Paper text:
NDM-1, as a typical member of B1 class of MBLs, possesses two Zn(II) ions intercalated by a nucleophile hydroxide in its active site, which is delimited by flexible loop 3 and 1023. The two Zn(II) ions have been validated to be crucial for its hydrolytic activity to launch a nucleophilic attack on β-lactam rings in β-lactam antibiotics. The Zn(II) ion in the active site of [name] has been validated to be vital for the PEA transfer process; notwithstanding its biological roles in [name] proteins are still controversial. Our results showed that AUR irreversibly inhibit NDM-1 activity and disrupted the function of [name] via displacing Zn(II) ions in the active sites and thus forming Au-NDM-1 or Au-[name].
Residue numbers in the entry: 219 to 541
Write the structure that this text describes.
């Protein structure tokens, strides 16, 4: 392991103040320009709009355009300019640091896996929610596809087992992951119709493609809102907060480009312009940065450290999502 945060210290501990419980939703394939709050022509995010204390960040750029590239960068100390995907697995990352300081780290996954991020930590702290062995919400659609909302089921038991400790829970979403946007949501979120149902996105009627994509966003709005609602049930005993950031955007036929993964050197804007949301309870003392702060995935690591009152010289000056 190559360390950059051996100086990390927690200024206040959970035995001397309210313990902190945070959910970080690691989003998948969501575009900033398809969010209602960013100026989109459709109400793709209605449930989040009914919750007080949610900050929408209108200017967030992802480290890259693929899950394998972006996800390790999101938890890196190095920042996008110095990040190396091929050696990321051997670097101390922000979750290693928090775990060493006693924060209880949980990673649930309905996407694929942590892309290296969890590899140094006990495997018991990673759980696969793509399979019904763990996910109880798969039989809600004709595909028997495990849903993101299934990752909230049983978190109270996790909280009960970590009673009184600081907790950081990562929920790695399937979210809008393609090309089969139409399989990413249940019938209740099929509001924009008709929808594209083929793997050849270029042959699908363009409007029908956008419709399927936006319906999947409604399913993600629902999931994020339910994550906040779950946190709201522990607001008296814990300082609760929720961070959402998508790993990268998506092309939907602009200049003939579909799906994601374009090399950063010529990646279109829509593959790197991502939504981010931050929610916190009024008691936590956490203050969001301005909604239009120029932000990137580099802000995630300092946000997570600040949420748990942790300092580290490597990201001392780095802009975060919160003050
Ligand atoms: Au669009
Ligand atoms: Au992704
Ligand atoms: Au179109």
């Amino acid at each position: 392991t190559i360390y950059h945060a051996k100086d990390a210290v927690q200024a206040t501990k959970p035995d001397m103040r309210k313990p902190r419980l945070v959910v970080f939703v690691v989003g998948e394939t969501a575009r900033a320009d398809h969010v209602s709050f960013n100026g989109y022509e459709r109400d793709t995010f209605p449930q989040l709009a009914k919750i007080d204390g949610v900050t929408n960040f209108s200017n967030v750029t992802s480290c890259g355009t693929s899950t394998a590239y972006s996800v390790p960068c999101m938890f890196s100390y190095l920042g996008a300019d110095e990040y190396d995907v091929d050696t990321a697995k051997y670097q101390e990352n922000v979750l290693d640091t928090l775990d060493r300081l006693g924060v209880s780290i949980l990673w649930r996954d309905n996407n694929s896996d942590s892309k290296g991020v969890m590899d140094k930590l006990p495997k018991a702290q990673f759980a696969d929610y793509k399979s019904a062995t763990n996910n109880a919400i798969c039989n809600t659609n004709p595909y028997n596809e495990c849903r993101d909302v299934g990752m909230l089921v049983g978190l109270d038991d996790f909280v009960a087992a970590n009673n009184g400790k600081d907790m950081l829970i990562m929920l790695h979403q399937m979210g809008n992951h393609g090309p089969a946007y139409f399989k990413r949501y249940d019938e209740k979120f099929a509001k924009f119709t008709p929808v594209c149902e083929g793997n050849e996105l270029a042959k699908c009627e363009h409007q029908s493609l956008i419709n399927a994509y936006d319906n999947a966003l409604l399913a993600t709005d629902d999931f994020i809102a339910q994550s906040i609602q779950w946190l709201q049930t522990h607001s008296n005993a814990y300082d609760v907060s929720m961070l959402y950031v998508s790993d990268h955007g998506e092309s939907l036929g602009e200049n003939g480009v579909y799906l994601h993964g374009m090399p950063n050197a010529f990646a279109p804007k829509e593959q790197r312009s991502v939504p981010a949301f931050f929610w916190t309870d009024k008691q936590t003392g956490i203050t969001p940065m301005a909604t239009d702060t120029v932000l990137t995935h580099d802000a995630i690591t300092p946000t997570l450290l600040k949420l748990f009152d942790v300092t580290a010289d490597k990201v001392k000056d780095r802009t975060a999502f919160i003050r």
